[PDB]
Amino acid sequence: INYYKDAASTSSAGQSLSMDPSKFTEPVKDLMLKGAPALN
Amino acid sequence: INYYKDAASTSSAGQSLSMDPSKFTEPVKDLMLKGAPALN
Amino acid sequence: GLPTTTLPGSGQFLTTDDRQSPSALPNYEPTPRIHIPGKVHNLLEIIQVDTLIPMNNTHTKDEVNSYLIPLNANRQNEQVFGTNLFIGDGVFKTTLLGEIVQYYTHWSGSLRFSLMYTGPALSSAKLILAYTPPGARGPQDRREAMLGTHVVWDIGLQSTIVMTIPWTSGVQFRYTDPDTYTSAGFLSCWYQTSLILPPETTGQVYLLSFISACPDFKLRLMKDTQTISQTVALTE
Amino acid sequence: GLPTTTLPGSGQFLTTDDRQSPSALPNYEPTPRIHIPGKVHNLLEIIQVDTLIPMNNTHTKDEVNSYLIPLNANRQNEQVFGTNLFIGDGVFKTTLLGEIVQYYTHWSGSLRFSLMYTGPALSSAKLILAYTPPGARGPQDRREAMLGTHVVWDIGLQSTIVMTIPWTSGVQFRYTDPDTYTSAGFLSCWYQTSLILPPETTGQVYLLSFISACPDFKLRLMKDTQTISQTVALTE
Amino acid sequence: GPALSSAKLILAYTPPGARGPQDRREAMLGTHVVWDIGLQSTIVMTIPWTSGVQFRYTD
Amino acid sequence: TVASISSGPKHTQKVPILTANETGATMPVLPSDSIETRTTYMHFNGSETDVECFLGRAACVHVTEIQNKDATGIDNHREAKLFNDWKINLSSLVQLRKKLELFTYVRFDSEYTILATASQPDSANYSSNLVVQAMYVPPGAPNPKEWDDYTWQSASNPSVFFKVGDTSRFSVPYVGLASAYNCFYDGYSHDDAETQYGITVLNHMGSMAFRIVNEHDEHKTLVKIRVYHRAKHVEAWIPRAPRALPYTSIGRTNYPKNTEPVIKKRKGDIKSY
Amino acid sequence: GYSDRVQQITLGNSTITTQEAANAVVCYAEWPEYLPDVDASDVNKTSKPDTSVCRFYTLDSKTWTTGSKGWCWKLPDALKDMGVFGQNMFFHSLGRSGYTVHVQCNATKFHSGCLLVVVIPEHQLASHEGGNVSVKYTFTHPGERGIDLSSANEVGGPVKDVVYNMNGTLLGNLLIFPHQFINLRTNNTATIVIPYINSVPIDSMTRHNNVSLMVIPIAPLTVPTGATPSLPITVTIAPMCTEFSGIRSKSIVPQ
Ligand SMILES: Cc1cc(CCCCCOc2c(Cl)cc(C3=NCCO3)cc2Cl)on1
């Protein structure tokens, strides 16, 4: 129950439960498959 | 939920969301169209 | 008896909170409303009405004359007036727009700057108004001025010209109190050809200038105005 | 009037509680969000990116050189480097992994340790990396080392080797600040055959080493890092 | 060159109207190809037809 | 969810553990690519590492102090701490600072808690009960000159009145100019040759001003204000390397000269355990 | 027969071929794109010179020697003088751009050495003076010359200490930023595609640089016996999807 009118006044947000490290761990242009050779 | 009986005791009103500047910006008797000459 | 816990902030008085209160006058009946022309709902409604700018600020005590921008016959290439666009300060500051902007911290939007010509009907003139977006200096000559937002105004039957300073900005809000990062540009005006008076006529002619906000405009984060203060409470 | 009772804890301020509060700026409209590449949602997303380990810690002032593990041509049977696995201390401590682990009290999961070789292309080498699970001493010679988790790495076209320290543990969580009961083992590396340089070439070659966490990883019970402190508030 | 050597060259085409470039900075602002010397031994640069008039004289 | 699958002996032409780090990727290698594993489940979600959780607890961001005393003959209230101000900034204290600077841009609503306690360091008959008044002077607002000015009227300025010993609490939307707060800014206000450098030029959101409403009693009373800040509704972009050296200034990245080696030197060899 | 190894990038009227690449990085896995209306604020129609600005400019070459500490360039600064890109830059109030960065360094199979090529969004530098000394404008706007981390401290300039990234963080953790290594034994180029990253939809190109490109030797250069002890490093960069807005008089900037 929100007792207040504005959105800033609500409690903390709830877990992204998004999670996708590939923008950070695999930003390569041509896709690399694990097990296939790195450099062909 | 109002806890009180009288109307003065309720919280602030809620946004007019009315908004019509023409009584102030265009109080002319004969309607002016933008693009048409001001004085004919 | 229902168990409760009180949180931090209990008992505080926040002048901006909005809650219910007991009425001191239970059951009282207010006077009926009758109709009155003129109701205002948003300050955004009124800042779109244009008001005069004391552009000619060069006097030494407030006078009707600082509303008049003078024009000289026969000058060519030269500059009519210049100002930066800190709408919360300087020429703008006493105008209705300036005066309301000062109740808020941030503004964004387009401005409408118009000039109404008052010279004899048998005279003629062509002026250029230029808006210089943030990043360059106030233009120093028309050549410099004409490379930015500009309108060649031809003085005619139609007495006023409405220039718009379109919102040119990286950041989507600027501060109303003058700030650098957040600065908006300059506005200048020059003779395009020149003012020419008819025979039997002489002297200076003046332009009146107005400012109002486009429907584009946003103002946010209310605060207190530097435009009013006091040292003791007033009495009757 | 509804009857209430207040419980123990009323009026306390717990920095970790999550409740509603009145907004000081009623009705204010925040700037629109625009798109920005790079959004982070979990610290677990970032500790999977590998970063370099200053393994060569033997210097006396921080230098680019403590990131370089040297290799000697023609040595046989010998040991390249050794370290315990207290990820919250020692070599690991300044790495991004080490640096985040320190915001939490407990960790569990697999680690990925990789070595990238930088020697001339016409050289060759075979190294053995060994993980020694808790309970034995840091290995003292390859024979000892090779009886635990190990990978023979053959230096080739493929420049890096990724060793995983699989989670070997009785207790399902270990403390990030070094603790005995909770200790994780040792990591050592030895020549399997030996580094061989081509003609016209000489000196030391170096390995770069990285650390990142497997998708396996768990961190819990947040706390304050020993990695930052201060004596007076900072001013402008 | 020997197979164990390496090199990176830039070839630049300068369309009519400017002088023959005098340094790479000048050269690199017109049609150019960075050539990386490798296994593939030749590089084919094209001088695309850049012209007002649709024919030029051979003399 | 499985944390590890079961995997047995391998003798392949398909080697997942050989990679080329020069590419910039961190290949997702697992225990089961290089040893024989058994199935195990995660039993865990990664709840407490969510950025909302990481930045969502109250941190002390500022400690100031004001006193209640006779202002008679004081030529400079501000200077007598008849009232102070805090030029809103979250770079002061470094505990919360390091955490925030893990990201480049950050967007969130703030919840402030303000604790005020009183001290009476010299002989008093009693402890008086004072009421504090915290008012946020938005930039371009009449700055309090005195302790009972016309500014304190704060008729358009959000202000809160609470008792010393007690706590005040409220939350504020994200009042950033842009789409997010810049944790770092490699630019200037304008193309000047002497203009400052950093964010200290970007983060100009006025200051907060405190004062004691009560007049003065016979003794003097020291009131010390602690402001706590909790981020709610957090959004963070572009992770960066954590802060290694100590901080010297609000808003610049500068570290102190002749600082000490931040990497612990081995007591022994590279070969040491 | 496609290898990760050979590549061709054609952009405008300029083409690059590498026969010894190591894939390419696209920052944060996003490719440069123009500014959508839903994200727009300034009402001005923007100018998109296209092929006259989106081509490859090769900056002047550097020389890696055994004593090198590393070099740093800022964008869009490094290009402030390249062809029409630069003119547009000084002439509009606002502009926006992504880039393709191609760093080149070839050697032979007897050399060793490894450079880190990294892009840091919003790289705010530190003053070597400490305290709250600022870093003057000119110092953070080196132009095509970039900053040479092995040059001496100057007054009003930034600190040039490599193991601290010019800001109080450790060299070892720069790997959290989009980056690629050039390891003579593997690699001979590094290529990174940079999408436009800012907290505003469009900004000023002169008062704010939005990325620093940094090339840092990490495993020292080691040449074969009696080889000349140095290699040149060349940086070629191409603006991509560039847009300029708010045209006028032409900025005048310090120094
Ligand atoms: C980054 C970053 C984020 C912030 C926070 C800025 C704070 C915005 C203004 O916040 C307040 C508001 Cl809107 C009101 C009050 C207040 N109202 C009554 C008493 O205090 C106090 C603050 Cl700090 O600073 N740097």
Swiss-Prot record, chains A, B:
It comes from the Viruses. It is found in: Virion. Myristoylation is required during RNA encapsidation and formation of the mature virus particle. Interacts with capsid protein VP1 and capsid protein VP3. Lies on the inner surface of the capsid shell. After binding to the host receptor, the capsid undergoes conformational changes. Capsid protein VP4 is released, Capsid protein VP1 N-terminus is externalized, and together, they shape a pore in the host membrane through which the viral genome is translocated into the host cell cytoplasm. This is Capsid protein VP4. It comes from Human rhinovirus 14 (HRV-14). The lineage of its organism: Viruses, Riboviria, Orthornavirae, Pisuviricota, Pisoniviricetes. The chain holds residues 30 to 69 of 2179 of the full protein.
Swiss-Prot record, chain F:
It comes from the Viruses. It is found in: Virion; Host cytoplasm. Interacts with capsid protein VP0, and capsid protein VP3 to form heterotrimeric protomers. Five protomers subsequently associate to form pentamers which serve as building blocks for the capsid. Interacts with capsid protein VP2, capsid protein VP3 and capsid protein VP4 following cleavage of capsid protein VP0. Interacts with host ICAM1. Forms an icosahedral capsid of pseudo T=3 symmetry with capsid proteins VP2 and VP3. The capsid is 300 Angstroms in diameter, composed of 60 copies of each capsid protein and enclosing the viral positive strand RNA genome. Capsid protein VP1 mainly forms the vertices of the capsid. Capsid protein VP1 interacts with host ICAM1 to provide virion attachment to target host cells. This attachment induces virion internalization. Tyrosine kinases are probably involved in the entry process. After binding to its receptor, the capsid undergoes conformational changes. This is Capsid protein VP1. The chain holds residues 584 to 856 of 2179 of the full protein.
